[PDB]
Amino acid sequence: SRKTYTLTDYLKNTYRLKLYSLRWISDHEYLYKQENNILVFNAEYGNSSVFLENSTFDEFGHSINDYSISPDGQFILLEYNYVKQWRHSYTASYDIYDLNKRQLITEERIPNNTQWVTWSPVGHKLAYVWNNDIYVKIEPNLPSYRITWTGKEDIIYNGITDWVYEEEVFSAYSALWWSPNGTFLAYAQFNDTEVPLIEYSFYSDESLQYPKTVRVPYPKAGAVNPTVKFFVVNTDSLSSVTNATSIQITAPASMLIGDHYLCDVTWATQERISLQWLRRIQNYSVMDICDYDESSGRWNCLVARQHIEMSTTGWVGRFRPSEPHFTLDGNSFYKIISNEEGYRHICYFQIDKKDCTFITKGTWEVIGIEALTSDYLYYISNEYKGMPGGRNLYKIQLSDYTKVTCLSCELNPERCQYYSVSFSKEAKYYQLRCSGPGLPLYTLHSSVNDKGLRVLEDNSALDKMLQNVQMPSKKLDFIILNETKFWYQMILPPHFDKSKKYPLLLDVFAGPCSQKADTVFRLNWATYLASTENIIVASFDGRGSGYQGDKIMHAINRRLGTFEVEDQIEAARQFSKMGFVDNKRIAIWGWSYGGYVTSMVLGSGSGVFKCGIAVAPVSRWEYYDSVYTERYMGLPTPEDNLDHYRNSTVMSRAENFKQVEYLLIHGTADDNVHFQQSAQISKALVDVGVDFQAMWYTDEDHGIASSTAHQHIYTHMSHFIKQCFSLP
Amino acid sequence: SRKTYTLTDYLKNTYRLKLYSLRWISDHEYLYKQENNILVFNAEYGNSSVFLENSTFDEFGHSINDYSISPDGQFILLEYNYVKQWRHSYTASYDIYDLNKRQLITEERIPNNTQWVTWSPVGHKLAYVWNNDIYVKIEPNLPSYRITWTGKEDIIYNGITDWVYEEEVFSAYSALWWSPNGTFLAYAQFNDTEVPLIEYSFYSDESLQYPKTVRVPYPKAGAVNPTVKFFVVNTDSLSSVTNATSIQITAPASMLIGDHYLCDVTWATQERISLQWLRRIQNYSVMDICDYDESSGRWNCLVARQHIEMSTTGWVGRFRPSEPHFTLDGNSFYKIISNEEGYRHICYFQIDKKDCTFITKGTWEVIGIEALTSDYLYYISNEYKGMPGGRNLYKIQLSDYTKVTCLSCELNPERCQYYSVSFSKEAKYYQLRCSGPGLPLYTLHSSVNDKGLRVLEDNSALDKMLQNVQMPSKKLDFIILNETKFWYQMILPPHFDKSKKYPLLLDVFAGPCSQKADTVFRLNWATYLASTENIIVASFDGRGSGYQGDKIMHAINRRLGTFEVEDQIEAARQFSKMGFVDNKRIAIWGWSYGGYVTSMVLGSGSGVFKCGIAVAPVSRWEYYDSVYTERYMGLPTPEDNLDHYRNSTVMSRAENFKQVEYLLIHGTADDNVHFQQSAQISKALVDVGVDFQAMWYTDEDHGIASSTAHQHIYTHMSHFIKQCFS
Numbered sequence A: 001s002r003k004t005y006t007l008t009d010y011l012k013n014t015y016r017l018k019l020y021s022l023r024w025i026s027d028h029e030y031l032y033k034q035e036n037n038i039l040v041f042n043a044e045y046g047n048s049s050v051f052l053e054n055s056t057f058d059e060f061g062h063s064i065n066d067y068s069i070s071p072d073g074q075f076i077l078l079e080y081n082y083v084k085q086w087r088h089s090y091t092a093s094y095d096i097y098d099l100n101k102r103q104l105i106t107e108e109r110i111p112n113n114t115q116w117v118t119w120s121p122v123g124h125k126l127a128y129v130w131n132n133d134i135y136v137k138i139e140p141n142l143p144s145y146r147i148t149w150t151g152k153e154d155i156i157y158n159g160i161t162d163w164v165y166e167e168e169v170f171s172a173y174s175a176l177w178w179s180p181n182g183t184f185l186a187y188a189q190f191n192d193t194e195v196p197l198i199e200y201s202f203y204s205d206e207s208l209q210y211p212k213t214v215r216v217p218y219p220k221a222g223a224v225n226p227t228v229k230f231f232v233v234n235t236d237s238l239s240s241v242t243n244a245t246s247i248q249i250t251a252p253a254s255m256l257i258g259d260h261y262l263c264d265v266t267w268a269t270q271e272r273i274s275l276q277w278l279r280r281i282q283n284y285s286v287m288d289i290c291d292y293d294e295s296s297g298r299w300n301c302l303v304a305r306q307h308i309e310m311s312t313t314g315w316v317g318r319f320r321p322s323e324p325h326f327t328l329d330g331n332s333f334y335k336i337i338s339n340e341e342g343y344r345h346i347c348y349f350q351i352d353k354k355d356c357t358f359i360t361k362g363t364w365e366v367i368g369i370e371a372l373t374s375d376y377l378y379y380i381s382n383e384y385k386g387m388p389g390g391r392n393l394y395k396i397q398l399s400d401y402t403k404v405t406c407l408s409c410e411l412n413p414e415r416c417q418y419y420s421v422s423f424s425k426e427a428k429y430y431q432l433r434c435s436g437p438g439l440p441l442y443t444l445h446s447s448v449n450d451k452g453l454r455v456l457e458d459n460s461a462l463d464k465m466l467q468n469v470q471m472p473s474k475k476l477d478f479i480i481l482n483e484t485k486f487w488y489q490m491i492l493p494p495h496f497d498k499s500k501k502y503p504l505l506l507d508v509f510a511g512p513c514s515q516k517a518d519t520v521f522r523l524n525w526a527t528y529l530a531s532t533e534n535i536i537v538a539s540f541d542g543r544g545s546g547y548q549g550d551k552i553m554h555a556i557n558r559r560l561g562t563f564e565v566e567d568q569i570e571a572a573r574q575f576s577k578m579g580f581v582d583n584k585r586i587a588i589w590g591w592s593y594g595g596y597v598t599s600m601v602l603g604s605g606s607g608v609f610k611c612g613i614a615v616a617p618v619s620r621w622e623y624y625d626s627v628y629t630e631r632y633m634g635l636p637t638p639e640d641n642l643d644h645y646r647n648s649t650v651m652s653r654a655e656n657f658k659q660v661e662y663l664l665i666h667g668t669a670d671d672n673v674h675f676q677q678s679a680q681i682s683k684a685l686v687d688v689g690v691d692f693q694a695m696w697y698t699d700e701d702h703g704i705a706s707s708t709a710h711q712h713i714y715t716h717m718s719h720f721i722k723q724c725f726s727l728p
Numbered sequence B: 001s002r003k004t005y006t007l008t009d010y011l012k013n014t015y016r017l018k019l020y021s022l023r024w025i026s027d028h029e030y031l032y033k034q035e036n037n038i039l040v041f042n043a044e045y046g047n048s049s050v051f052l053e054n055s056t057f058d059e060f061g062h063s064i065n066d067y068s069i070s071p072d073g074q075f076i077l078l079e080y081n082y083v084k085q086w087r088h089s090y091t092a093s094y095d096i097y098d099l100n101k102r103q104l105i106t107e108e109r110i111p112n113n114t115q116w117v118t119w120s121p122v123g124h125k126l127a128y129v130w131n132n133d134i135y136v137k138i139e140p141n142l143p144s145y146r147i148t149w150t151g152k153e154d155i156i157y158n159g160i161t162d163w164v165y166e167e168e169v170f171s172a173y174s175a176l177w178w179s180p181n182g183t184f185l186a187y188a189q190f191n192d193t194e195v196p197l198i199e200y201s202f203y204s205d206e207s208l209q210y211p212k213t214v215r216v217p218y219p220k221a222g223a224v225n226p227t228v229k230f231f232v233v234n235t236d237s238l239s240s241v242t243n244a245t246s247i248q249i250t251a252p253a254s255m256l257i258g259d260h261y262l263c264d265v266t267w268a269t270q271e272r273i274s275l276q277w278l279r280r281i282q283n284y285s286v287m288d289i290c291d292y293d294e295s296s297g298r299w300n301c302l303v304a305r306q307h308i309e310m311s312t313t314g315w316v317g318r319f320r321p322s323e324p325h326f327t328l329d330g331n332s333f334y335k336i337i338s339n340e341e342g343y344r345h346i347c348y349f350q351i352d353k354k355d356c357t358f359i360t361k362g363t364w365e366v367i368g369i370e371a372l373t374s375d376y377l378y379y380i381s382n383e384y385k386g387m388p389g390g391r392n393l394y395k396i397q398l399s400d401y402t403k404v405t406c407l408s409c410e411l412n413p414e415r416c417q418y419y420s421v422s423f424s425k426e427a428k429y430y431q432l433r434c435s436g437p438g439l440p441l442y443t444l445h446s447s448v449n450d451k452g453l454r455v456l457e458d459n460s461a462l463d464k465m466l467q468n469v470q471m472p473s474k475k476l477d478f479i480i481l482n483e484t485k486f487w488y489q490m491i492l493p494p495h496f497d498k499s500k501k502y503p504l505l506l507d508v509f510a511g512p513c514s515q516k517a518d519t520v521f522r523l524n525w526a527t528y529l530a531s532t533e534n535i536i537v538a539s540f541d542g543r544g545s546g547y548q549g550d551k552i553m554h555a556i557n558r559r560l561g562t563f564e565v566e567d568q569i570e571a572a573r574q575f576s577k578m579g580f581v582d583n584k585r586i587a588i589w590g591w592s593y594g595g596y597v598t599s600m601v602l603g604s605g606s607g608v609f610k611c612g613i614a615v616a617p618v619s620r621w622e623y624y625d626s627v628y629t630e631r632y633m634g635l636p637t638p639e640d641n642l643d644h645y646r647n648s649t650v651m652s653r654a655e656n657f658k659q660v661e662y663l664l665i666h667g668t669a670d671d672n673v674h675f676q677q678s679a680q681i682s683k684a685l686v687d688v689g690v691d692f693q694a695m696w697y698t699d700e701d702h703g704i705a706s707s708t709a710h711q712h713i714y715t716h717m718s719h720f721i722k723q724c725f726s
């Protein structure tokens, strides 16, 4: 008896992981939305109270997609008519509800199709973007103040990023930053005038007679990049001057010498802001620390306060320069950077001193700085057990770096080895989120002694259900190649028997700084394959992978499509040597970068793989965006790295595909890795007469995440894999 | 016992059908192009001479893909730098070789990127279109006369057709008609200003960093159509210091009242031109007959002299109203029209008489009028043996309609039941072109006594090769669908045994006035499927088929996606019970309209078909072009036919696809049946949770005819079919 974890179970989300989403409104309380009623909790005792009743907005005439209470808790921003755009961006309508009088504001309302809205960090001021222009509202019911007039569709962006800045630089749509108390409003401006447009059809609903053409300013490798400008305006002078001037903070000269980017902006104090810039050739980065000059009204950035951060073996940062964490007085800060041993650690900076002081160990890395107090600095790292795929919360004593404590390592070592954290406004409390290898466990803690106040969610319900199913196991481990260890993970079928030979599916990504082997617990396609189809699903983090030091991460610098690819092939060999793998049924599949690698492997001539599936794959780097691509590949010019750009394409290996069963899949509306990329792969396979399978997904983007589409692609892929392994 | 006809044989064109493409230059001679040269032949005796050896341009610096000899014989138009556009259209570079001096003309040459060129009908005058404007050269080496100045890319077309006129009306890129003696240059003008544009991406060569977007004025059902104007310019009058004057021929008022089309242009004499207009609602057309007036310089089209052709059961014409054949004095004419019973026959008209006189009749139809002499009217029909799928040349005595003679029926009955013809200028000689059921046979004859002069090409070489391969056979027969009989054909495997059970594949098209069951000999995919895979490939012509009368053809009027799909299923149903047909293994595939019908059948819930393949199918008529779609469906408005437009989509049948194995294929650069159509089919199947097989072909259009793609798609489809059949 006891059934297995079926494809339907996966697709219908029968076994759901319960979460405990919380939102800190103060240093002592947080909000917890219950799909109907949003109540506020007292961290100290856990007692609750309804903050906004379930029916408070019925008869609104619109479904509320999200709420956003202002800092002073006097107003709430109701978000509706949501319409996704790219990964983070989206458009929608907004209404402000006065809580002080249980009244909805019906005057000077925020425009329909607003692109972005943000409360000031204090009070209830509003700053929003509409038609690529920035507007500011001092009072919710009063007329807005326009800040920019240069806004222009697909050409000029004020307060919001263009496409590449959203996805690759800021991993965020917003391009404006309120100062801590809300006096100043800093924002960036992007000019995509000279940037080539990506164009693709969008079919929409059946009812559309003529397909629509989507055109998005998008710089492909080597193409013209958007240009950027930074401004700071004083919102306290809006109601006094009629057209408040936006002060521009330019340079650095070392940056203005050529193409560059604005990669980070964080306020240190009420009158101090830091700006990090990056050269197009991303091996050089510069941080400026500018102070408001009350006399000149301008913003000066002393060169003595300018910090250079470069890299000789690769690019700066994992995906971009590290973010700074200033001490309360804004005179010093903490930033993760790779030490002399190529390992990423926290080092302490003084704004006017160029040499920083490292405060963390060695053979492991700090993942991120989570909180800073007058006493300790809280951060997450993978030091525990020397497991690069594990994650824990530590705290180091600011006065004595030799004093480091792990607040999560021992809470429940068997069930929890991967943690994320969420502190209260002042770090008085913090929620710990354990995500594996056991079922997600959420707990609340007071920072005084790190005492565990209580368990917010332990997924006991789920646990009961899963004991009624032949669930698969997960093995996380390492192999040693060229005297260096490389981690991998396998999702073993129930009742694993090392004596039997199993068909293995190599789940891959292998992009720079990626990590596919961890302690995270997951209920996904692989879960079904192992549980029901008795298939071993493995992942391997080879050269180029991250969180293990630059020696490994920078291994593929300027050489994408090589080691990373070879290591996945070697991994299959290594897994075969373990004796429980069927040499005749080894498959491989990936998505995005995983698709690129899968494809490169499939067309490698290394007869290891029988079949493979590539989803939304990159086929040639000259087709992908500039920021991401050039970071690892440099420029596609003959004086730079053009040769390797051309030698690392998937099309150039078309002939080799005659010896493997291939399945190419791609959404036609993919704005990230354009359908074009697969379009050229199919065409190349056609030119050399190689048969293969294909599937396009109309109007789906890079995520192919529509409910029906999601279920269709996995259902389709299962058939392919089953057939390739002669199952069931 | 010998090899079979394999997929490679087909894809590689191992067994190639020989042809005899001649071009009549007079009433007595013709040109015969070859690989290394061009010869002139004497029809009377068969003797010939070398006109030029091509080696005349061994050092032209360009690869010529076509030659065009002035009717004069004095000049050769050399077409190179070919660049295909749509079905008939394309651009190209041109050079003119003066045969009198045997030298290339160096001055005033034709502009590169010329969209169209045509010699006048008699001398050596040239009319060409460049950048949407018309130009005329009176002498090959002389400066051109700018006829029009309004041309504008994608907006105004002078002398060439827009996408929809090229494809659905004139079946040609040309929109200019020289008068018989080359005095007048008639031409149409198209305004697409308000016509919506279909847009799609073209990826090009791997080296292209950014995909380019193709946009082309294309009216989908109910959209804003391009408007048209007609003009006539006297080429003997054009000055050089003055802009050429173009007289316009407008109306009819019964046409200007609403949307309409110019569907036919036919000169009657040196000074009389006829024009046929069709209302957007294609069940009413009017023919104007206009004569030039020297004193006023205008062209007058006397009312009363116009003829109305309308239909009450459907649309007018098979695809459009037929072309008129005017007598020598242009005072009368013959033209095919639908008689009272719905059959198409030849009707005799007097330019100023309202009713005409049918000179043919019966339950069969005249396919087309091929030649007219004071003595006879030569035409092709399917009267012989009552086989709608057969074609023979006949001649009817203009003095006594009782005397009709079949000129080809008996030449070789066993080998030939399908002919086409090519008469000399004045119909003194004619070339018969047999295309089935046996190997193609080309013969030359003389009209005086209908003597079989000589055999031009008998495909004897090919016949010797095929005798060494196990070729399949073809059975043409019919079934009775309550009262009426409907024809079908089956490509049968070698050594067919009615005792053995074979898998059947229903090859379908079934569009209005289509014919898939005929006596033509074909070397195609089905040949391989039957020859090598022993698969019976059938085809059926049900309600909607052509060449059998309006009762059959107009049955699907305003009702596409109904009777023709149901009948396709009825047929399959009866084939399955035949005994030598494995009812558990019946497939179905088609292209374009066939794709649509295949998809409609597969989503009908018949349970008759196991699997099916749809290539570049139409999914919903609102996505197809206006001229074709509207002709049968009317307008997609609630006052008209919107309801049926909505009830006849493929997506509406998604849920039914769960019971079958479907393969969807479509070229991404399809300008005809937009990739959009299959994108909407896949999306609807996904939304209903139906798994299917798919395959796109980047940068391939409606023909998916690039050499590699052609091979790939058939290779892909073959695997799919045998997989389904095993």
Ligand SMILES: *[C@@H]1O[C@H](CO)[C@@H](O[C@H]2O[C@H](CO)[C@@H](O[C@@H]3O[C@H](CO)[C@@H](O)[C@H](O)[C@@H]3O)[C@H](O)[C@H]2NC(C)=O)[C@H](O)[C@H]1NC(C)=O
Pocket: A149, A150, A243
């Ligand atoms: C609030 O102040 C803004 C800062 O100057 C002002 O910016 C714009 O000012 C003018 C007006 O649109 C723009 O146009 C200029 O026109 C001259 C004359 O043709 C050109 O020589 C010049 O190159 C430019 O085109 C400016 O481009 C623009 N300046 C900036 C920095 O944005 C706002 O218009 C103003 N708002 C209001 C309502 O007055």
Ligand SMILES: *[C@@H]1O[C@H](CO)[C@@H](O[C@H]2O[C@H](CO)[C@@H](O[C@H]3O[C@H](CO)[C@@H](O)[C@H](O)[C@@H]3O)[C@H](O)[C@H]2NC(C)=O)[C@H](O)[C@H]1NC(C)=O
Pocket: B150, B156, B191, B193, B194
């Ligand atoms: C091709 O066909 C066009 C109409 O489809 C001709 O044009 C005419 O039609 C437009 C409206 O569609 C009229 O108005 C235009 O101008 C006004 C003001 O600039 C705009 O508000 C409006 O939207 C249109 O853009 C024009 O008045 C009318 N043209 C003329 C000259 O009156 C066009 O002329 C025709 N070309 C040829 C060579 O036939």
Ligand SMILES: *[C@H]1O[C@H](CO)[C@@H](O[C@@H]2O[C@H](CO)[C@@H](O[C@@H]3O[C@H](CO)[C@@H](O)[C@H](O)[C@@H]3O)[C@H](O)[C@H]2NC(C)=O)[C@H](O)[C@H]1NC(C)=O
Pocket: A150, A156, A191, A193, A194
């Ligand atoms: C962002 O970048 C674009 C350039 O990519 C800026 O456009 C450029 O603006 C200048 C204004 O100094 C234009 O110059 C002007 O040209 C006209 C002739 O067209 C001339 O008469 C004027 O004297 C002046 O020289 C320039 O043409 C234009 N270039 C392009 C490519 O459009 C744009 O202004 C910038 N936008 C913002 C808000 O920063």
Ligand SMILES: *[C@@H]1O[C@H](CO[C@@H]2O[C@@H](C)[C@@H](O)[C@@H](O)[C@@H]2O)[C@@H](O[C@@H]2O[C@H](CO)[C@@H](O)[C@H](O)[C@H]2NC(C)=O)[C@H](O)[C@H]1NC(C)=O
Pocket: A040, A041, A042, A045, A047, A048, A049
């Ligand atoms: C949560 O409940 C407290 C009540 O605290 C009580 O006293 C503690 C010692 C402990 O025994 C708790 O379990 C008891 O419930 C509320 O605190 C009140 O807050 C208001 C201001 O909002 C303050 O003026 C009162 O003095 C507080 N009451 C007490 C007894 O000190 C708190 O507001 C509750 N919050 C929610 C969200 O329900």
Ligand SMILES: *[C@@H]1O[C@H](CO[C@@H]2O[C@@H](C)[C@@H](O)[C@@H](O)[C@@H]2O)[C@@H](O[C@@H]2O[C@H](CO)[C@@H](O)[C@H](O)[C@H]2NC(C)=O)[C@H](O)[C@H]1NC(C)=O
Pocket: B040, B041, B042, B045, B047, B048, B049
């Ligand atoms: C084709 O042949 C004729 C001549 O053929 C001969 O004469 C016939 C009348 C008949 O008796 C045949 O058996 C003979 O073989 C050519 O006629 C000549 O044409 C040229 C002009 O082209 C003219 O100068 C001559 O006077 C004609 N002579 C005759 C006999 O009429 C004809 O030109 C040949 N055509 C080709 C394409 O070679």
Ligand SMILES: *[C@H]1O[C@H](CO[C@@H]2O[C@@H](C)[C@@H](O)[C@@H](O)[C@@H]2O)[C@@H](O[C@@H]2O[C@H](CO)[C@@H](O)[C@H](O)[C@H]2NC(C)=O)[C@H](O)[C@H]1NC(C)=O
Pocket: B109, B110, B111, B112
């Ligand atoms: C049609 O073009 C050809 C080729 O010209 C080249 O391609 C064109 C598309 C355009 O980009 C030109 O600038 C290119 O030079 C013309 O033929 C000549 O070709 C020779 C080289 O073979 C070149 O030196 C000449 O400049 C070209 N043009 C002339 C008139 O000399 C051709 O002439 C063009 N059509 C006509 C009739 O002018």
Ligand SMILES: *[C@@H]1O[C@H](CO)[C@@H](O[C@@H]2O[C@H](CO)[C@@H](O)[C@H](O)[C@H]2NC(C)=O)[C@H](O)[C@H]1NC(C)=O
Pocket: B149, B241, B242, B243
């Ligand atoms: C013939 O007509 C054309 C178009 O009307 C004339 O060419 C235009 O002349 C005007 C006035 O000089 C220019 O602004 C245009 O640029 C010209 N070209 C076009 C396409 O409009 C031409 O001059 C006329 N020729 C004569 C002698 O009447």
Ligand SMILES: *[C@@H]1O[C@H](CO)[C@@H](O[C@@H]2O[C@H](CO)[C@@H](O)[C@H](O)[C@H]2NC(C)=O)[C@H](O)[C@H]1NC(C)=O
Pocket: B281, B283, B310, B311, B312, B313, B634, B640
């Ligand atoms: C030509 O087609 C038109 C439009 O389809 C026919 O007119 C319509 O006929 C129907 C009767 O079935 C009426 O309900 C409509 O009101 C008529 N008007 C229109 C334009 O919709 C017309 O009868 C046809 N002509 C012929 C000769 O059959």
Ligand SMILES: *[C@H]1O[C@H](CO)[C@@H](O[C@@H]2O[C@H](CO)[C@@H](O)[C@H](O)[C@H]2NC(C)=O)[C@H](O)[C@H]1NC(C)=O
Pocket: A181, A182, A183, A234, A236, A270, A271, A294
């Ligand atoms: C927070 O904003 C500024 C940050 O410096 C605070 O200081 C005032 O800043 C303005 C600049 O526009 C100066 O002109 C004033 O003189 C500053 N005030 C003082 C104390 O000198 C400001 O006080 C803060 N505002 C709020 C609302 O907290």
Ligand SMILES: *[C@H]1O[C@H](CO)[C@@H](O[C@@H]2O[C@H](CO)[C@@H](O)[C@H](O)[C@H]2NC(C)=O)[C@H](O)[C@H]1NC(C)=O
Pocket: B181, B183, B236, B270, B271, B294
């Ligand atoms: C071809 O046709 C044109 C027009 O029909 C002929 O031109 C006419 O010739 C007569 C002389 O018999 C004149 O009276 C007319 O004025 C001409 N009409 C026009 C508009 O040109 C032309 O001569 C014919 N070509 C030949 C050589 O027969």
Ligand SMILES: *[C@H]1O[C@H](CO)[C@@H](O[C@H]2O[C@H](CO)[C@@H](O)[C@H](O)[C@H]2NC(C)=O)[C@H](O)[C@H]1NC(C)=O
Pocket: A281, A283, A284, A310, A311, A312, A313, A634, A639, A640
């Ligand atoms: C970061 O990498 C770039 C690679 O372009 C280096 O750029 C230049 O300097 C190299 C050696 O100093 C040369 O080998 C490169 O050719 C040159 N770049 C170009 C386009 O010619 C840069 O020095 C590196 N930065 C550091 C400090 O290592």
Ligand SMILES: *[C@@H]1O[C@H](CO)[C@@H](O)[C@H](O)[C@H]1NC(C)=O
Pocket: A109, A110, A111, A112
């Ligand atoms: C937003 O759009 C709706 C519907 O068109 C309209 O009723 C409403 O007034 C609009 N609100 C604003 C802020 O324009």
Ligand SMILES: *[C@@H]1O[C@H](CO)[C@@H](O)[C@H](O)[C@H]1NC(C)=O
Pocket: A481, A482, A566, A567, A570
């Ligand atoms: C040794 O090199 C790398 C490690 O440096 C290892 O992954 C690889 O498999 C070995 N051989 C080669 C040439 O890749």
Ligand SMILES: *[C@@H]1O[C@H](CO)[C@@H](O)[C@H](O)[C@H]1NC(C)=O
Pocket: B481, B482
């Ligand atoms: C007659 O045949 C047609 C098509 O062959 C079919 O649709 C119909 O049901 C049959 N009987 C009647 C009464 O129409």
